[PDB]
Amino acid sequence: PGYYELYRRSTIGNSLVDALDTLISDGRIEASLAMRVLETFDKVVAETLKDNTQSKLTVKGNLDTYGFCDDVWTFIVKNCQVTVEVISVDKLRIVACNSKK
Template sequence: MGPAYWYTPTFTSRPGLKMATNGQSFYELYRRSSIGMALTDTLDDLISDRRIEPQLAMKILANFDRSITEVLADKVKARLTFKGHLDTYRFCDEVWTFLIKDVTFKMENSSQTVQADKVKIVSCNSKRPGET
């Protein structure tokens, strides 16, 4: 089996970890996913065609941040285990980042495994700031 590619957002000065605006407190992490990028591209096209205002696009993105966070927390029940060699780890601004080498992933209730040379995992607190 060839190298596996596992989606992990790439951050430059942590833009994907900003909190949503307008008083909301959800990470913008999923905007870098394929569905988030598709939404962003579509909103950009609508703004360019003057079919919506940029302020509406920002509200839509904030709603996306909230919705995808809630749906993934509520609906996804699959478990994944992985083994690998921890290369680097960091904890900054309440966010853990792990760089793992020679990783093997295994889904619960499946004998199939997926291998990757290197994986970056970004982990954020699931609770909003101020929640206990």
């Protein structure tokens, strides 16, 4: 009964893992508490991206690799144009989960 954990691999999620690990190594918290923070994080990111996101970007390029396993799509787009709100990107890994249960 939880949310996807892919977001822990993002910049903000990875920073949280860092902060969380320093407190564990300092013995300021237990690893279990750290894991519980990470699981709350998963929820919060999913809700924050759903309710406080407005931008709509688009990616155009050559699909170098694709993959679909366990209800997860993975795409490696090379030599593409990412337009936000235009960005040239040599390579871009896209990992996505199902919007449905």
